[PDB]
Nucleic acid binder design. Sequence first.
RNA 1: UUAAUUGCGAUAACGAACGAGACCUUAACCUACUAAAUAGUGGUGCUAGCAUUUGCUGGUUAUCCACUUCUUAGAGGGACUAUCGGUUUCAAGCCGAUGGAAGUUUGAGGCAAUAACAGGUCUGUGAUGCCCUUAGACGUUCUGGGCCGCACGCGCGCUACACUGACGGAGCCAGCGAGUCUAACCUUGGCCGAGAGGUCUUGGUAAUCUUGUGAAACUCCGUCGUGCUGGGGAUAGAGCAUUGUAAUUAUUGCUCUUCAACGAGGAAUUCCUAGUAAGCGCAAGUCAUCAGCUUGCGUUGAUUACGUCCCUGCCCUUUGUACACAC
Lengths: 53, 100, 61, 143, 103, 167, 82, 145, 141
Amino acid sequence: ENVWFSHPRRYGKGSRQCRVCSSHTGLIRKYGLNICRQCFREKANDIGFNKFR
Amino acid sequence: IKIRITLTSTKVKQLENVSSNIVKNAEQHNLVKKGPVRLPTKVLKISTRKTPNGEGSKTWETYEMRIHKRYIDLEAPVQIVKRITQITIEPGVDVEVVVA
Amino acid sequence: GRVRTKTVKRASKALIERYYPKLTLDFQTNKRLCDEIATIQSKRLRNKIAGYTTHLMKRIQ
Amino acid sequence: PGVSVRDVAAQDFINAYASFLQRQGKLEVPGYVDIVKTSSGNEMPPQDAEGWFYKRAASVARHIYMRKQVGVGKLNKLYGGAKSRGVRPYKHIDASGSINRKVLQALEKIGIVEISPKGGRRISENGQRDLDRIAAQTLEEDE
Amino acid sequence: VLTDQNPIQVVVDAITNTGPREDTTRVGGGGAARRQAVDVSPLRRVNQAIALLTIGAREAAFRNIKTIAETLAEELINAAKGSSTSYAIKKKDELERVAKSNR
Amino acid sequence: LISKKRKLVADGVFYAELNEFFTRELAEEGYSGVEVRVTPTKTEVIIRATRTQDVLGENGRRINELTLLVQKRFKYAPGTIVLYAERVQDRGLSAVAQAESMKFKLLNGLAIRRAAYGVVRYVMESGAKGCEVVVSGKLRAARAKAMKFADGFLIHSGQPVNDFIDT
Amino acid sequence: KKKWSKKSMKDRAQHAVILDQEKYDRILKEVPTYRYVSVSVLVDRLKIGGSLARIALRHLEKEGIIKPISKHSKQAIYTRAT
Amino acid sequence: SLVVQEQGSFQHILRLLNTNVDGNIKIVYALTTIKGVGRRYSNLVCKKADVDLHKRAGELTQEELERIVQIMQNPTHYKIPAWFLNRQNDITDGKDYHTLANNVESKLRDDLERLKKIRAHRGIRHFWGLRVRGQHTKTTGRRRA
Amino acid sequence: AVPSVQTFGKKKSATAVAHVKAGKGLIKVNGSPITLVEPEILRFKVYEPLLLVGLDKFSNIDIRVRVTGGGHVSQVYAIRQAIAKGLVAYHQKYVDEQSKNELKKAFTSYDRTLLIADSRRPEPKKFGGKGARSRFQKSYR
RNA sequence: UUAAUUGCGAUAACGAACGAGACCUUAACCUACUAAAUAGUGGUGCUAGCAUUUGCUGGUUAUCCACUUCUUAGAGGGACUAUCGGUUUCAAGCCGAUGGAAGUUUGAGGCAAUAACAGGUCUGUGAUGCCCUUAGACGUUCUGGGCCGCACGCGCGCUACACUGACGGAGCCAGCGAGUCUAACCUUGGCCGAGAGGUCUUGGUAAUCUUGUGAAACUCCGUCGUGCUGGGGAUAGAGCAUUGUAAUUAUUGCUCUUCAACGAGGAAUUCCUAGUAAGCGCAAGUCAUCAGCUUGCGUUGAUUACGUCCCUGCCCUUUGUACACAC
């Protein structure tokens, strides 16, 4: 029908989801990562993000 | 024709020898050129809490990554874009040929 | 504190064990000689190894 | 000698150029001089009342002399300041765009600042000579 | 302008005239409280002298028409000549008397 | 098109997505790692595994299927990405291979003590200077306790642990 | 509730806001005896409000007696010029 | 020297717009006592009246206070911006108004009563005594009763 | 090829380069004379290198200094350090040691900061406080 | 003795391993190398203003030439407490003075051992055993409220309680970092409006354009005056705009007006040894819009120790124990 998904999710948290688990709440949109923070820690050393200091 | 070799990577050693090989191919034959220009490194930094939950003392992190950018400026006719175009590419670093 | 680690202590004694005259009574002259003798991966580490060696070179006199 | 706008202190020159702008008010006088607050950050209108327009024009023209191209937003950012947002902490707030626009256009009418390429304004050729002549005067007034 | 000598000379004699010579210390050890008098090093004498002069003029300039400039000037001049109206001189009297009583 | 900062962030995500897909699909093939080499137009993705014969598989349909699988996912063009298959060297010094191997032994029903000590003996006989495996969870009871099987020496702090130890 | 603090100023002795005559003779004959004069000095001893010392401090500086030893930001130091 | 004497025309207290206007202070700030006139509006009124801003309230000639007073009761007639008034586009008629000492408080009660009679959210909360702009009240606004 | 030398100087993050060539005694900063500072109190602090030894050595040189970065006092400390090093550099390409060595001794005899830059630099901020050493207010109960 | 079971040495113990240290990153130094209109510098032409007497201040990418001091880097150097004088079986080392850019492991972080909590999380996971449940479902989805609701009690924070001030003019200097492709981001410039903001365009996938982020605190001229006042802006009334399908228990921004507590804070308690505290603003994160928050950055920059176990806690040894879920 036309009422199932008529709500306009294009300007908020409901319009964005993780590419790994599609989790809400905290995400990392910086540099267009679109990944939530807690699994970002697990896969941090896969994208080239290291920790020296 | 103003061929410029742009190189970006995260590994300094692999990007260095690619420039060295490109500059060593340049100083052979004649190929009057401009040497490696050392652009400032772009250091990404995403600061995140270590705790996956909300419990725990405030302990933040910083996952950083350095991008080294160097461009090589060439100046010669077609008789070297049959020759320079033979990419000396190692894993990591990339090349973008730009003319004029 | 300036207490030297056993790593630089044992290596310096081993250097003088077989190289009496090589390590001269001055720091700068034999500091590079220690690098030429032992495989040291750190400039800081060989600097301290030569410092203790030179000091031991002075004490034996 | 070789005196110029850079061979003078700021306070003396701006007052001197304000002095040689009030004596003959050739430039202009906007209709809303006595009701502006110079910004949304400032809480009160300037207390100079009668003047304060040639004083700004003197400061703007002197600022133009040492630079090449500026804009009305650039003047707003320069002439702005911190705003007391109540109990909230201070924050930088740009000045009133209309005020700097009227000053900048007024400097164009007399012939002291004109438009420049690559955008923005620039000191005028007649503007440079009279502004430098001001410096030769203010130094010798104290002498 | 007032008290026409060299002001640097006035500053140095003021701090030498408002630096405590005897002071008390904590010795409570074990038993509620108890004081005990000790001596003051020359370095601490200068540090205490400067601190007393600054706080006295700062407090006397609190909610008062007199600016900190004249308040500092009056405090230093009065302490220079050893008058009782000085806050620093009065404080030096308190510390010395307290140490003298608990000697 | 895409700025350099976003481009290198995207390819690492491309590496992360590709690595996890291969790990979940070729787990039974003794997958070890991947190298994503990029070159203009064509790009090559070298796959490291032990059972390289099964990695390609049945004349090569599976490796062609894997090439076609990442084809539609990553929105490439026909003939732009080619999947390779390189045999893993020093298989006894690849923690990823041993971690998968231990998982299959535990899933089959092999004894934990025999499997954990069997793999560590295989590791150091291959030419390693130290190994350590930890098994934690509900073992032999309901309350969870961790078991540690180790031999040799293992540094735990500094740069060299990242430089040397693979976890 | 409780404050544990005092609430009182003193007794505001409000004085001249516009310069009068009976004290105009006072100022011209009383400040030339000030070894140190400034804004605050005649505020206390001569008992002068806010916007009259600044005019009076500008008065004698331009006209006569006291002289600019150091007139500067928020402090106009003048002596007993004679 | 910008020194002038006084003859006796100084009055220590004023009374404008049916309210107490204390003297001894500058005219720009002595008019702030009127309920509904602030620092900016008083500055605007004094500026258009040409009353020599650096003048005490007591040292003001009577011919200038009426000119100030008339501007208070009819600002829009004396070239005052339409955006410099407290009561803009009145709900009764729509003409730009300016409430005064007694008008500021009285008109305030009328609009609350209009809000209350219509049973709006702002009207009922005003009668209740709570906040009407949406502030939190869990930890704030305690010592009110 | 006209006589000239160049130097540099920093205080916290500023830079100041003095192209001290051969001239008639012009000391300018950003195109303005030396007498126009900005703090108007540290004007004698930037006047320093002019007055420790005398103005006679300054009569055959022109010091042009361009400054960028830092606060107003940092700019002042950049200017004084640059001109002090500019004076020695002019004496370190033309003039004798007796001119230079007692020049370069007397400058440090008064204060070492004229030639030697301040080694202290801002420290990085650590999590848990507004600054490096400072921490947020912790409480119990 | 050391920050350190870090070393000297002693010694039924010898040889060792992990941690620490070592190591990595960053901040400092390089007038020595490689260089460079996406960073600059000087010079040659074109050109402007002041004085012209000899100069100074400028503008100018196709006007070209030369350089890398400042600007960025890559490969490297430098720092080891070096020497001397005291103290120490005269050993580890410590202290003072004798270079330096750096002599509190050069400063600051990263990494960070064995064992443990019956610590936090099934509301991160398409990781989860078990229980409940699955179609008027406890799933997903639609509409409107709610998480903000206040008699009251506490914890982080922002404004202050005015003259070292407030207000109005001028001077007016930083660093970190981010920014649009098949989207609509950072927006320069011109025009309109008191302002918010609107409008027509331009530059930028980035040291290049936003931006020299012309930031604020700061300083100089004035207004003011010791006044619950020109301090302070809670509380409200009216109007003007932006964001969104939607703003009403005002998102926020702008203008006027109302101008309340607060006059330095009681028992008690938090942080801190150098660019550190503190004052000051900026960038980024959450973001369609909304900072009083957090993570970082730079600006101004004190006093006070160079010690102790007195209070609150920690490590080792000796000793005592009716404790072992262990004062």
